[PDB]
Amino acid sequence: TYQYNMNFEKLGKCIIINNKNFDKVTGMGVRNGTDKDAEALFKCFRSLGFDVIVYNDCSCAKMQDLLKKASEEDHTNAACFACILLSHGEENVIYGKDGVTPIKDLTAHFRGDRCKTLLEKPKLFFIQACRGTELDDGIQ
């Protein structure tokens, strides 16, 4: 067969990181609109069947630690895992309150060799963040 097996007890965890406020030293502004995004995301992913958890104004160390611990939980009875990041960003990199952390290091926690209970199961990351400073001027 050609579809991911969805016959599990649970659809899976959906961790949302809703970063609105940043330390002044980062020079990063308040992300107005983000609570609205987090509320809409939470209702959508609850409706799909995920156990949604919303974290707010997280530090870089918190983002790594709560992502590392989620990787260490037991996902044997879950069909998939989802994480959503709402923050400031630059290429390869997402902002905590504290400063900046590489996206690859946040997702690496769920590699097959580092999260055996999600082996052969989809790991979804939705990322709302800048990836640089270029602008897309469009065309008619």
Partner: protein
Amino acid sequence: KIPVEADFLFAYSTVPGYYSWRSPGRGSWFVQALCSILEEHGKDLEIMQILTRVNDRVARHFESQSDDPHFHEKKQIPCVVSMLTKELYFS
């Protein structure tokens, strides 16, 4: 044996190197587009079908309304990176 990097999917709101637009009162474009599509089709469409429609809605429905003409009438396209090995339905 299977690869350690298999079965990831990254749905970024924007392409590498580019800005990502956020309306202060209506939310970021990618998220509001994403939630709309999931509300109507999350339980009946495959994940790539969902995100492709999201790509379309961000590309067509959105244009930045700004006064500084450096940011006037700009556009955005999201970016899907799939290491998935199967079709994925939420049912």
